[PDB]
Amino acid sequence: LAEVAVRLQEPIVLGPRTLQVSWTVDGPVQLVQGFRVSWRVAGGSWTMLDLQSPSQQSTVLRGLPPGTQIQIKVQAQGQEGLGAESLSVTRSIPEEAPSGPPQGVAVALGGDGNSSITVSWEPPLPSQQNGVITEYQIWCLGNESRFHLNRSAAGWARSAMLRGLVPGLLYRTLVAAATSAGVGVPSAPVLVQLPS
């Protein structure tokens, strides 16, 4: 089980956040009864998987974090235990649009003129960003599209000033974060209706 050597091939993406991992075997093949695949973010603790057959020389890792580097190793198992670890391979998981909204969206009166608001926010949860945040989209939607207010802000911004709200109109204020892959999910709306 120590003489056997595992040869890891280059991983292949199937569905989003997946990696098809395959390998060949060289040595006393008759001793192997299965394989234990281990993977981690290149970080955190290793995640292990047990394969109950010596013919399963491939597996599909799923739900891998977008915008990260995944490190993969594989070893053979038998009646003795576990064998030598193969050489690790590392592949990048493509960034995605954020899957979680910015946190703590708030609205305050303030800005230019007499009917402006300042919208503030915090980034999405780190596990929901799916990449480096490069942009925030801010919307102030009325009942008609001619009343919509929209601004963009840089990844370092945490506020945006929106002017020209019509008194008496109900506005839905939303913020979304974006990565290089696109604009993510918007926050729950903060409703604003200025006095008239």
Q: How far apart are CA 51 and CA 194, in angstroms?
A: 62
Cα separation, 35 vs 78, in Å, equals: 9
Tally of CB atoms within 10 A around 121: 23
Experimental method: X-ray
DSSP string over 153-182: EETT--EEEE--PPTT-EEEEEEEEEETTE
Give me the count of residues in the chain: 196
Q: Is 130 left (phi over 0), alpha (psi -120 to 50) or beta?
A: left
Breaks in the chain (C to N > 2.5 A) come right after 42
Q: Which position has the token pair 């891998």? A: 64
Helix ranges (DSSP H) in the chain: 126-129
Backbone torsions φ then ψ of 107, nearest 5 degrees: -125, 135
Residue 36 near residue 48 (C-beta atoms within 8 A): yes
The domain locations on the chain are 1-94, 95-196
Phi, psi dihedrals of residue 145, rounded to the nearest 5°: -65, -20
* Contact criterion met (CB below 8 Å) for 7 and 23: yes
Could you give the CA distance from residue 92 to residue 106 in angstroms, rounded to a whole number? 35
